[PDB]
Design brief:
The PDB classes it as ribosome. Keywords: ribosome, translation, release factor. The entry is titled "Crystal structure of the whole ribosomal complex". Chain A is 50S ribosomal protein CTC. This is part of a larger assembly, with chains A (177 residues), B (35 residues), C (138 residues) and D (133 residues). Chain B has 35 residues and is largely without helices or strands. Chain B is built from no helices and 2 strands. Helix content of chain B is 0%, strand content 11%. Chain B starts with 16 loop residues before the first strand and ends in a 13-residue tail after the last strand. Chain C has 138 residues and is largely without helices or strands. Chain D has 133 residues and is mainly α. Chain D is 33% helix and 0% strand. The radius of gyration of chain D is 20 Å and the shape is elongated. Chain D starts with 13 loop residues before the first helix and ends in a 7-residue tail after the last helix. Classes of the chains: A little secondary structure (177), B little secondary structure (35), C little secondary structure (138), D mainly alpha (133). Chains A and C meet through β2 of A and loops of C. Chain D binds one RNA strand of 81 nucleotides through α6.
RNA sequence: CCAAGUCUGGGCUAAGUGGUAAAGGAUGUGGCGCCGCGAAGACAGCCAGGAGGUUGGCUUAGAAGCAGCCAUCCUUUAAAG
């Protein structure tokens, strides 16, 4: 949303209210613009979890946003970001999240819980074609059970930029099973 | 009493400033908070 | 930064003796956690402990995860007196590099675990930073 | 304007009935002999009484009927909950049995409707150990 | 005291800090962002019911929020607690 700059001035820039952030795209880049105030808001939403874009000179109103960056620093306040769009029908590198609900099985009865080394899902469905919020939770939880890749259950866009059997999300003893 | 490290008892015990000093106060002998 | 004699000649190849990592429960978004800023050969023991007392006060779901672990150690009095000092080991830990990803109170809505960790900081030693993660804490 | 928890078949104890009533303007002797009329049928079970006086120093009023907790236990054939609710649920029933037990509890139940009747039996069930499946 | 602007400009102190110290506390004070609303006329004041199936399970000799281990739901209605 907006964000400007692109000359050659990171220090002061990298300072005050404007944080660096390259204009990255397949084939071309352009001095870092943006700002340490927009990043906020938007970013705050869900960086590489949905997507938008800003109007700098109406130039090229396109999506893709961030494919890297960091609040690095100790303090925990980012500085020096990466930005790449995608006006193509190739959109792959697509990492969008996946949520459950709380289906009661090991929890609200066994107190047991479950780790989710997954959460996210870098795949590649129908380029410029993904439900910013995809949910899938067949339920199940408790004892020494576990679920991961393999099973899963992918809708429409048949990608899986990923593999089978691997960090899905199991149920462990928040105390003992 | 605790001179050092006072922090709210009864769901009231107030925060007062005497001599810049901060000494707990609240409807209870069981709160005579002071530092 | 004086460190030890080697990873297998003086004292290197241990378990360091402690109480493992993970606790609490999952959680996809909710980013609940703890880190620092202080530098200190984190006092093993003190360490191990601490964190633990953490579970002691909570119990189940709240990423009682914790990303620390000592692995080297000091030495001192053993032998003659003060001069040509050989070495007697004791007390390993790990450098808490001027702040960084401590342990995580990670989960949907379960501050009943935030306060926890909290109790976890209180403890510890080198001050500590109370914080949230990508998004905050819900 | 008092409230007690007197026993059955024993209307003469001085320790509880004595001080708790005499100082409130209640004749201990006469208020007791009247209980030997209605508590004689169901003697043995503690029955709470709610005496309400006026400005003449008398009356007895509403004592009761009995228990309504042990007869429900006789049908099911559980004295008590398993352990702790929402942690060891193992007592499932059915849909059709919960539907007919609420149709008679209506007098002291929330509203006279059919949708509101099934909702109370859902709250007092999961707070104990009777999951509906 | 001892030579040299009790210079001018605009902030911040109300403790003599300055004139040695850490973990640790607290509507101190001054400057920045958030959630709810004031004509569903808002927080602290004040009038009132201060609702019923809630008086569920371990322990009951007593949980029946106001011993503590598990629940955490339904409601006829001014809402729920």
């Amino acid at each position: 949303m907006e964000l400007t700059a692109k000359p050659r001035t990171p220090k002061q820039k990298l300072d005050e209210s404007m944080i660096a952030a390259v204009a990255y795209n397949k084939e071309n880049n352009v001095s870092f613009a943006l700002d340490r105030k927009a990043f906020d808001r938007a970013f705050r939403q869900q960086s590489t979890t949905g997507l938008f874009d800003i109007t700098v000179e109406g130039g090229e109103t396109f999506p893709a946003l961030v494919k890297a960056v960091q609040m690095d620093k100790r303090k925990r306040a980012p500085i020096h970001v990466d930005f790449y769009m995608v006006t193509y029908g190739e959109p792959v590198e697509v990492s969008v999240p996946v949520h459950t609900t709380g289906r009661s099985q090991g929890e609200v009865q066994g107190g047991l819980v479950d780790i989710v080394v997954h959460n996210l899902q870098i795949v590649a469905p129908g380029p410029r074609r993904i439900p910013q919020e995809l949910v899938v939770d067949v339920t199940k939880m408790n004892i020494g059970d576990h679920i991961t890749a393999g099973d899963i259950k992918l809708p429409e866009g048949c990608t899986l930029a990923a593999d089978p059997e691997l960090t899905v999300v199991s149920v462990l003893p928040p105390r003992l099973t | 009493k605790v001179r050092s490290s006072v922090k709210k008892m009864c769901d009231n015990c107030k925060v007062v400033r005497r001599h810049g000093r901060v000494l707990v106060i609240c409807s209870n002998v069981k709160h005579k908070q002071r530092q | 930064s004086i460190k030890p004699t080697r990873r297998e000649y003086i004292s290197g190849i241990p378990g360091k003796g402690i109480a493992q990592f993970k606790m609490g429960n999952n959680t996809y978004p909710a980013q609940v956690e703890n880190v620092v800023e202080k530098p200190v050969q984190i006092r093993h023991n003190a360490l191990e402990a601490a964190r633990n007392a953490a579970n002691r006060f909570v119990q189940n779901s709240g990423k009682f995860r914790i990303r620390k672990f000592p692995f080297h150690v000091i030495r001192e009095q053993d032998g003659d007196g003060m001069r040509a000092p050989f070495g007697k080991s004791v007390g390993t830990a790990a450098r808490s590099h001027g702040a960084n990803h401590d342990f995580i109170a990670w989960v949907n809505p379960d501050p009943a675990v935030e306060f926890a960790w909290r109790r976890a900081y209180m403890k510890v030693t080198p001050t500590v930073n109370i914080d949230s993660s990508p998004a905050g804490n819900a | 304007q008092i409230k007690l928890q007197l026993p059955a078949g024993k209307a003469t104890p001085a320790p509880p009935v004595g001080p708790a009533l005499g100082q409130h303007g209640v004749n201990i002797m006469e208020f007791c002999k009247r209980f030997n009329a209605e508590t004689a049928d169901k003697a043995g079970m503690i029955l709470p009484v709610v005496i309400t006086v006026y400005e003449d120093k008398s009356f007895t009023f509403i004592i009761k009927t009995p228990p309504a907790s042990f007869l429900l236990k006789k049908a099911a054939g559980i004295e008590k909950g398993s352990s702790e609710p929402k942690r060891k649920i193992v007592g499932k029933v059915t849909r059709k049995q919960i539907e007919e037990i609420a149709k008679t509890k209506m007098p002291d139940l929330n509203a006279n409707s059919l949708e509101a009747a099934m909702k109370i039996i859902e709250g007092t069930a999961k707070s104990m150990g009777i999951e509906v499946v």
